[PDB]
Structure formats: structure tokens, C-alpha cells
Amino acid sequence: SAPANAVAADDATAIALKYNQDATKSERVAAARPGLPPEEQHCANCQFMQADAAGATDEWKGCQLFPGKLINVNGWCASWTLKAG
Ligand code: SF4
């Protein structure tokens, strides 16, 4: 299941960032941000990401923009950008 500190679709920042766990049914293709095809784009390959979170699982990891909380790796937000590294 999602962890207690999962970033909710209803989270005020998620609402600003257009985060969705369902990256597929997020503004991915709509935004079509360059670097990697939307299909491949997720938090999993976001620049603003943290596999450096207290209580990281595997499916649920940290975001740079969401410290403390946990994003789904296979989810996406508008502030994506490919990994620069
Ligand atoms: S900034 Fe990146 S890791 Fe954070 S929610 Fe957005 S896409 Fe995911």
C-alpha cells in the first residue's frame, strides 16, 4: 500500500505541481516536457528527486520538492526534468 506520508493527489503542493501517482493520467503528455518521452518520464527519473528519504520504501521514494513526504517513483509532477547525472 502507499505509506502514511505518501504525497496525496490532493496535497496542496501536489495540486500546484500537478503531481499524480498515476503519471500516465497526469499532465505528462499534455506538458510534453523535453529530455525523455512522456511515457518513460516519472519521479523515478526526475532531477528534483530523493532516494535520500527517511523511510524510503522502493515504489515510494523522496522528491526534492517534497522532503519528509514520499512520492511514488512511477508517478510524475510538472516540475520533472530528466536526471542530470
Ligand atoms: S519534482 Fe520530480 S520527484 Fe518530485 S514529484 Fe515532481 S516529478 Fe516527482
mmCIF file of C-alpha atoms and ligand atoms in Angstrom:
data_model
loop_
_atom_site.group_PDB
_atom_site.id
_atom_site.type_symbol
_atom_site.label_atom_id
_atom_site.label_comp_id
_atom_site.label_asym_id
_atom_site.label_seq_id
_atom_site.Cartn_x
_atom_site.Cartn_y
_atom_site.Cartn_z
ATOM 1 C CA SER A 1 0.000 0.000 0.000
ATOM 2 C CA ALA A 2 1.089 3.655 -0.163
ATOM 3 C CA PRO A 3 2.877 4.835 3.032
ATOM 4 C CA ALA A 4 1.301 7.229 5.558
ATOM 5 C CA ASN A 5 3.440 10.133 4.265
ATOM 6 C CA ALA A 6 2.629 9.378 0.610
ATOM 7 C CA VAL A 7 2.192 12.604 -1.385
ATOM 8 C CA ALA A 8 -1.577 12.716 -1.929
ATOM 9 C CA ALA A 9 -3.087 13.731 -5.282
ATOM 10 C CA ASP A 10 -4.995 16.281 -3.125
ATOM 11 C CA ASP A 11 -1.844 17.664 -1.464
ATOM 12 C CA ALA A 12 -1.682 21.489 -1.764
ATOM 13 C CA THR A 13 1.808 21.311 -3.292
ATOM 14 C CA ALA A 14 0.859 18.313 -5.467
ATOM 15 C CA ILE A 15 -2.026 20.492 -6.733
ATOM 16 C CA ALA A 16 0.491 23.259 -7.529
ATOM 17 C CA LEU A 17 2.968 20.797 -9.130
ATOM 18 C CA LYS A 18 0.343 18.691 -10.920
ATOM 19 C CA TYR A 19 1.696 15.620 -9.182
ATOM 20 C CA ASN A 20 -0.100 12.343 -9.797
ATOM 21 C CA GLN A 21 0.797 8.806 -8.688
ATOM 22 C CA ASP A 22 -0.814 7.846 -11.993
ATOM 23 C CA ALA A 23 1.883 9.594 -14.100
ATOM 24 C CA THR A 24 0.072 8.050 -17.098
ATOM 25 C CA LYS A 25 -3.064 10.064 -16.148
ATOM 26 C CA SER A 26 -1.071 13.179 -15.302
ATOM 27 C CA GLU A 27 -0.308 16.267 -17.412
ATOM 28 C CA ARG A 28 2.724 14.370 -18.819
ATOM 29 C CA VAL A 29 1.826 14.098 -22.496
ATOM 30 C CA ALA A 30 -0.018 17.426 -22.193
ATOM 31 C CA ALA A 31 3.155 19.210 -20.976
ATOM 32 C CA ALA A 32 5.401 17.052 -23.201
ATOM 33 C CA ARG A 33 8.484 18.272 -21.330
ATOM 34 C CA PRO A 34 11.647 17.560 -23.403
ATOM 35 C CA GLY A 35 14.557 15.242 -22.476
ATOM 36 C CA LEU A 36 12.832 11.820 -22.361
ATOM 37 C CA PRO A 37 9.489 10.592 -23.821
ATOM 38 C CA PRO A 38 6.481 11.299 -21.519
ATOM 39 C CA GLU A 39 5.839 7.528 -21.310
ATOM 40 C CA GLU A 40 9.274 6.993 -19.665
ATOM 41 C CA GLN A 41 9.055 10.224 -17.583
ATOM 42 C CA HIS A 42 8.315 9.685 -13.869
ATOM 43 C CA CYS A 43 9.686 10.823 -10.459
ATOM 44 C CA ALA A 44 11.885 7.698 -10.925
ATOM 45 C CA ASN A 45 13.924 9.744 -13.477
ATOM 46 C CA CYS A 46 13.144 13.274 -12.212
ATOM 47 C CA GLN A 47 16.011 15.678 -11.445
ATOM 48 C CA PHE A 48 14.192 17.048 -8.379
ATOM 49 C CA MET A 49 14.145 13.583 -6.716
ATOM 50 C CA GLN A 50 15.486 11.968 -3.481
ATOM 51 C CA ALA A 51 16.423 8.356 -2.943
ATOM 52 C CA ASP A 52 17.631 10.094 0.218
ATOM 53 C CA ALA A 53 14.444 9.990 2.325
ATOM 54 C CA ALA A 54 13.881 8.691 5.860
ATOM 55 C CA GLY A 55 11.635 5.662 5.405
ATOM 56 C CA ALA A 56 12.153 5.286 1.651
ATOM 57 C CA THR A 57 10.494 2.022 0.514
ATOM 58 C CA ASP A 58 11.142 1.097 -3.118
ATOM 59 C CA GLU A 59 7.981 2.157 -5.006
ATOM 60 C CA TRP A 60 7.759 5.156 -2.618
ATOM 61 C CA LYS A 61 10.875 7.434 -2.519
ATOM 62 C CA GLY A 62 11.504 11.127 -1.758
ATOM 63 C CA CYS A 63 11.074 14.147 -4.037
ATOM 64 C CA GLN A 64 13.485 17.111 -3.783
ATOM 65 C CA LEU A 65 10.430 19.419 -3.610
ATOM 66 C CA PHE A 66 8.702 17.041 -1.112
ATOM 67 C CA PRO A 67 11.103 16.391 1.770
ATOM 68 C CA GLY A 68 9.573 14.330 4.620
ATOM 69 C CA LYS A 69 6.758 13.011 2.379
ATOM 70 C CA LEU A 70 7.166 10.227 -0.217
ATOM 71 C CA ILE A 71 6.329 10.302 -3.958
ATOM 72 C CA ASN A 72 5.543 7.195 -5.992
ATOM 73 C CA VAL A 73 8.538 6.603 -8.301
ATOM 74 C CA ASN A 74 6.197 5.690 -11.199
ATOM 75 C CA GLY A 75 4.172 8.916 -10.625
ATOM 76 C CA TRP A 76 5.015 12.330 -12.124
ATOM 77 C CA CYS A 77 4.725 16.108 -11.483
ATOM 78 C CA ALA A 78 5.116 19.104 -13.895
ATOM 79 C CA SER A 79 8.426 20.020 -12.211
ATOM 80 C CA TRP A 80 10.012 16.866 -13.663
ATOM 81 C CA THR A 81 13.158 17.425 -15.832
ATOM 82 C CA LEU A 82 15.389 14.399 -16.612
ATOM 83 C CA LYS A 83 18.198 13.332 -14.340
ATOM 84 C CA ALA A 84 21.346 15.440 -14.856
ATOM 85 C CA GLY A 85 23.706 12.710 -13.639
HETATM 86 S S1 SF4 B 1 9.747 17.031 -8.609
HETATM 87 FE FE1 SF4 B 1 10.207 15.168 -9.561
HETATM 88 S S2 SF4 B 1 10.356 13.678 -7.981
HETATM 89 FE FE2 SF4 B 1 9.294 15.429 -7.287
HETATM 90 S S3 SF4 B 1 7.195 15.000 -7.566
HETATM 91 FE FE3 SF4 B 1 7.941 16.093 -9.262
HETATM 92 S S4 SF4 B 1 8.478 14.637 -10.745
HETATM 93 FE FE4 SF4 B 1 8.370 13.698 -8.821
#
